[PDB]
Amino acid sequence: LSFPRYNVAEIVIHIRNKILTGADGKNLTKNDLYPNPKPEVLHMIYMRALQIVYGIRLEHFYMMPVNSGVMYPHLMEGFLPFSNLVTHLDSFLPICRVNDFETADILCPKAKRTSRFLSGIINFIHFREACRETYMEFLWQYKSSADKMQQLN
Amino acid sequence: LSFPRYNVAEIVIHIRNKILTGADGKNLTKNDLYPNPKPEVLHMIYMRALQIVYGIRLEHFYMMPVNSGVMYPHLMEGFLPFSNLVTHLDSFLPICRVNDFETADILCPKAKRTSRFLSGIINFIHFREACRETYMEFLWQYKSSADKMQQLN
Amino acid sequence: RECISIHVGQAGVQIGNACWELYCLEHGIQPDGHVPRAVFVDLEPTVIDEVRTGTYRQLFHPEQLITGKEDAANNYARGHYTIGKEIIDLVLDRIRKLADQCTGLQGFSVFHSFGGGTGSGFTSLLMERLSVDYGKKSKLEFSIYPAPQVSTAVVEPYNSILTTHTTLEHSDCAFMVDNEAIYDICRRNLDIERPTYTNLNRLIGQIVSSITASLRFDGALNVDLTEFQTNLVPYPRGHFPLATYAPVISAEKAYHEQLSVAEITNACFEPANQMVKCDPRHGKYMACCLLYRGDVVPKDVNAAIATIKTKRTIQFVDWCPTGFKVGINYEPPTVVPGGDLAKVQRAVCMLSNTTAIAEAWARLDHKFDLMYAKRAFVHWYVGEGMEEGEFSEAREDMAALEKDYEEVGVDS
Amino acid sequence: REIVHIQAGQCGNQIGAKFWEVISDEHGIDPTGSYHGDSDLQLERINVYYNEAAGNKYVPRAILVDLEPGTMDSVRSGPFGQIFRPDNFVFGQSGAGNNWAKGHYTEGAELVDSVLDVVRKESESCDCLQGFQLTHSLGGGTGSGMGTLLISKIREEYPDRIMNTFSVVPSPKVSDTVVEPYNATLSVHQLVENTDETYCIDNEALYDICFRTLKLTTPTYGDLNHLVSATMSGVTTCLRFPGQLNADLRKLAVNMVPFPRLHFFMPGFAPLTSRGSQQYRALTVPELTQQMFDAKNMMAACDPRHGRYLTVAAVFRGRMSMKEVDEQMLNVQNKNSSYFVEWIPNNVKTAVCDIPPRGLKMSATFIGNSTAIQELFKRISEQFTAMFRRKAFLHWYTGEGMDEMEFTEAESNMNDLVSEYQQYQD
Amino acid sequence: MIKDPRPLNDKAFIQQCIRQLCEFLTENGYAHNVSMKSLQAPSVKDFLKIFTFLYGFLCPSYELPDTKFEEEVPRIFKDLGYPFALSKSSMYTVGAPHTWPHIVAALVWLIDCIKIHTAMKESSWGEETEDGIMHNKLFLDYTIKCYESFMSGADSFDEMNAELQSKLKDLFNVDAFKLESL
Amino acid sequence: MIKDPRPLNDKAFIQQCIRQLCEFLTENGYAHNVSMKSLQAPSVKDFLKIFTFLYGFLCPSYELPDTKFEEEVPRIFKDLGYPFALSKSSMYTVGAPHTWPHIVAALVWLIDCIKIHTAMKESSWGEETEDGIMHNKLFLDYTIKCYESFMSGADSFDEMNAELQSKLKDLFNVDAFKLESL
Ligand SMILES: CC(=O)O[C@H]1C(=O)[C@@]2(C)[C@H]([C@H](OC(=O)c3ccccc3)[C@]3(O)C[C@H](OC(=O)[C@H](O)[C@@H](NC(=O)c4ccccc4)c4ccccc4)C(C)=C1C3(C)C)[C@]1(OC(C)=O)CO[C@@H]1C[C@@H]2O
Ligand SMILES: Nc1nc2c(ncn2[C@@H]2O[C@H](COP(=O)(O)OP(=O)(O)OP(=O)(O)O)[C@@H](O)[C@H]2O)c(=O)[nH]1
Ligand SMILES: Nc1nc2c(ncn2[C@@H]2O[C@H](COP(=O)(O)OP(=O)(O)O)[C@@H](O)[C@H]2O)c(=O)[nH]1
Ligand SMILES: [Mg+2]
Ligand SMILES: [Zn+2]
């Protein structure tokens, strides 16, 4: 556990810039992340982050597993986003260099731990931007050479 | 974002000279472009600009897309000019060196941004005039040589 | 040992001036004697001013008289949220400044008028801020809930479905005295079509004297405030018993005064004498606290009650073997020198939780819907820091108060 | 608490003289004199309408707005006329033309700033402001136009304090003007969207109520005015008195307006018996509700019996039994369940002051919010169209810088206002 | 655009409107739960969430300013070309019995704008300019190309002129070994 | 999610609920003895042991804070997405006659969450990103790989770039001896 790159104030600015949008970001303030984080604010951030990186939509957070066998499916949709959110964060946070993520982090967030997580995400997000540039440059190079193919046949 | 060539006062004079006509230009004043721009004044300017450059008419701003499937077509004509205006400005402003144009620019204009846009248009308009001279000179040369053809056959 | 009191709302203040009157009257402490032990809150100055201009003028400290020159507003929202808020701090301060000065207190007898602006709203958060600052005490709120057909305010229910839901999770025992059902007593059991508010007040001003005053006063069968809530509430819902008095005979007309216990106790269960339009239409009692005062022989009681326990037509809840807290005091009642109260040498201020209110709440809830169903005066609250939430979500609240008062009874 | 009266136009002005003629006596304030008050209670709450300067000079805190000198110069040259501080007189020596447009857009619009100026000097007087009283007639320039502007500005300056409006809606049978529906429809429009309590009085609903409920054979204007002023005293000032159950503008507002339009009421006084004879004293109470709730006796033109009620506020002011009051109200609510709307379990808002009208034993102001007033805006709205259609005297408006879409606007608005009100009659 | 063609006081039409709104919200991932039931008399707070959502399809990432919505919402409907004025007082009571029919109607009209605007982002000529240009599609191509060069610091336009002459030879069969070979 | 679809005041349904709870506890090694009988009106102390057990399936090694359970338990049901509010006073009287039906119902709903969450730990795509990425599954692979290198102190990304180009040649048949052999 190194020190988080950013304190809460900086973290808000990076989330506004890179993760949240319009009203959502404008509403985001220090006091809903520290000293006690509003789990539903983190939910939105963690969810939007996943959407951006994995190209995934709100609808995907409402997928019901097939071998659940619950008696009232419609009564369970409040829980689905949590369950899915957790399943994906399991895969994503290790990428952002966070290995000790737990379900209680969503249900009952702690100030320091969640500021460590948001830094790791924000860091990774800055890096994939750098990679995007390199990637899109290669992509433009190959889909332009596939055009000079049909323009030559 | 460099600095706009012109401030609001100069911008009015260039719009009178090069874009608006008669009453329309005579009515145009600083205070309807700054500090809060009258969106319906900008609508007229942006529209006339497009007409001049693309050779397009008022009627073209009332074209209804075929796969819209609205229930009351006649109730929608107030919106059509906006939608079309936006679709064309998408293509035109990049030419005038403006890449960050957004729908809110028409619906809810800001002083500085719209003075940047009007400068870019006014600049381009001065340049195509210079090109017109060169072009019309070449055009006169070739349609005059196509005449010395039928005058020789 | 003590029990502070917070009279909120013009009414709770009028009733306050009254209950406060009866007091000194039976304690030999004229206009200017000791020092009260309560406070007065209102967002309309002119009313608390009446305590500042009229009788019992100097028996109070301009410190236990809180006012908000501003506006009352017969609307919960404004009184609770928006305006009422500004004063609360200050209000509390006294019930924290007056709560300190004492010696091991027991609670705060709150006096409010359910369907008002300063009475419903404000208190809502006053009792609210108390349940947290002194969860370790008694919160018996003495209310004057909405006349069954003779309401006043046009909105009344809005204000009373809202004071109930917000206070419910904060009170210990809520006493209830129905303004209209008290008139009947003034028409049928005292005869007078000229009942000034100043009378109903003398009445509750009586039934109340039987609660605190005399009880906190030595006797042959003392009953502490805690005692109540314990022997009186079967369940956490700030349960609301009903107040009833026995010798409500006229000090002019008839005169059979000498009505031995055996009589005055039977006169409590007949529905036409209970300061509440909740006639035991079916409501099974589930606990009664028979507070007697004056010359009473414990056997007389432990017999007069026995006779009752076997009248059956008085059906008590199932899960309740015996629900009769016999409270005996010494000093007989003390009637106003020349009002209209008989003046007997023994009385029975019996209060109780009756599955009856299943009604009263019902009939008051229904009211609400009708209007909410059309939003009626809703814009008056919204524009006062409330939302479709607080209403709809306080309606659902009472809903489970119609089921609660239904389940705890009618079933075995 | 406090309020600041507003005498817009001549009428609204003429009435000012009567509203203050009364109120003062109901507060022991002689011309320039002080408080001669027979009692000591008519003083602890005066502030609501005056200001402390000298020590014997409590000056009415109202505004006198008018574009016709002669008027205010008749009110200022007569009886109580010399109690208003000159600063109060916001005149407009211009041509007070009878055009709504001439007193709302062209002529009045100028005199406005010099008014708001004072309406602020008075508001920022002291203590806490409650609202402003507004008198005027919706059948003229300085009344409907300029006064309807005064409020549109007031309601932008303090969307918190209330706004009671006393309008003299154009009487039916005969119109004391010609464009009337023009000046009217245009002012009601402004009303339905700024003031939040309007008490509509009808010069002919008064005559009637004044020539048959007061065998009075020569009902001069002074009278009508006097009767009206009698009601507006029961309303405000009154409630600023003690009472077993007192209310105040807001209560009145927060109990009477189910839906934000603002809705207009119809005031009714209690003891309305002819002098000598009639002095029957049948005023135990059933006699007052008998009164107040009958058709005739409603200062409005329309008859309640022609449409349910949404709210009612019997603001009584004279020692009585909260029982014989609270009770009566009920039977009344049951004998007429028919018209009293149902989705409001207790339409009636019983209010009870203590001290009564100086010389009387028991009175009770009535403020009804009945759906019946639908059949009045209808009237007005009709007159408009029948003449708008031909643009009758429209050149006097447009020629004053108006719009052909302005008239359209108002009518519709106020016309829709009729619609809505029916949404409850059903 | 003057008199509303719509049956605003027909229950079925207002019910149809609510259905369209409900459907649209659900099918476009609106974050809060909605139902035919929940949309009969929405709170102002709800309406503003719904309006903000819909308008965001036109103005991405839009939030309404924190005060003066009663002025803003009507202004926006006006600037979008809504033929019918929405009053300031409508805005305070949007969910009210005689008001919601007008407002739901307005929202559904907005939804229709979204549809029009979304189709427009697929498919919806001027060969001569009104300042004397003939073959404007050729001139614009020329002019644009010159501008890019100019904007790159170029002083002359030989590449562009040369290309313009190539195309002008093809538009009127003419050169040198043609006009003088004759 | 608004009005409860469940027959909470049907004896059989509440009995069914108790059975499910009893079964679940017994079959998952709950340390204390339970029976249909012992679960008709549990003590608050019991309820808290049962709740703590169930919730521990979601939050491993969870213990409820030593005070303010009446606030905590409801908060947790809210944060888990339980459609129905559980009142503070419910919590003090969980086992009471008119209360247990709501609470047992809530516990069984929680058990259903556990089931959903356990299935989710087996099985339950996005090929394009909303910031302009095409073939996101290829980009993410590339990006992740670059990150590991970077996080190892690497300054350049030749290995990763080379591998990216291999895959881009296969995605659009194109190279050098193809584009110039023609
Ligand atoms: C000897 C005696 O008792 O005389 C009465 C009287 O005869 C009657 C007929 C009065 C009389 O009123 C009228 O004749 C009248 C004239 C024009 C318009 C309206 C009414 C009276 O003039 C009116 C006067 O009213 C008051 O004093 C109130 O305080 C009243 N004051 C004024 O209207 C007022 C008049 C002049 C100057 C200043 C104030 C009031 C009412 C409500 C709110 C505030 C004030 C009263 C009781 C009487 C007389 C003097 C004959 C009545 O009216 C009122 C408003 O009380 C008319 O029916 C009632 C019944 C009264 O018994
Ligand atoms: N017994 C009794 N009931 C009263 C008394 N005063 C008012 N009430 C009743 O209490 C309710 C009136 O509340 P209001 O006086 O309107 O208001 P408030 O509760 O004082 O507070 P505000 O609305 O802000 O003025 C009605 O139901 C009255 O019948 C009184 O002195 N005694
Ligand atoms: N009750 C009443 N109505 C009046 C008085 N004066 C004029 N009116 C009415 O007001 C209308 C005329 O408007 P007016 O007051 O002359 O307008 P303005 O003076 O130009 O603002 C007519 O319907 C009259 O009956 C009055 O003193 N009392
Ligand atoms: Mg009060
Ligand atoms: Zn006797």
TrEMBL record, chains A, B:
Main location: nucleus
Gene Ontology BP term (one): cell division
Domain Kinetochore protein Nuf2 N-terminal: 1-142
The entry's keywords: Cell cycle, Cell division, Centromere, Chromosome, Coiled coil, Kinetochore, Mitosis, Nucleus
Cellular localisation: Chromosome, Centromere, Kinetochore; Nucleus
One cellular component (GO) term of this entry: Ndc80 complex
Family to which the UniProt record says this protein belongs: Belongs to the NUF2 family.
Function description: Acts as a component of the essential kinetochore-associated NDC80 complex, which is required for chromosome segregation and spindle checkpoint activity. Required for kinetochore integrity and the organization of stable microtubule binding sites in the outer plate of the kinetochore. The NDC80 complex synergistically enhances the affinity of the SKA1 complex for microtubules and may allow the NDC80 complex to track depolymerizing microtubules.
Protein name per Swiss-Prot or TrEMBL: Kinetochore protein NUF2
Source organism per UniProt: Homo sapiens (Human)
Record gene name: NUF2
Residues of the full protein shown: 4 to 156 of 202
From TrEMBL, chains E, F:
Subcellular location: Chromosome, Centromere, Kinetochore; Nucleus
Segments traversing the membrane: none
The organism's place on the tree of life at top rank: Eukaryota
Occurrences of domain Kinetochore protein Ndc80 CH (ranges): 2-119
Domain DUF5595: 127-182
Protein's job: Acts as a component of the essential kinetochore-associated NDC80 complex, which is required for chromosome segregation and spindle checkpoint activity. Required for kinetochore integrity and the organization of stable microtubule binding sites in the outer plate of the kinetochore. The NDC80 complex synergistically enhances the affinity of the SKA1 complex for microtubules and may allow the NDC80 complex to track depolymerizing microtubules. Plays a role in chromosome congression and is essential for the end-on attachment of the kinetochores to spindle microtubules.
Assembly and binders: Component of the NDC80 complex.
Family assignment from sequence similarity: Belongs to the NDC80/HEC1 family.
Name listed for the protein in its UniProt record: Kinetochore protein NDC80
Native organism: Homo sapiens (Human)
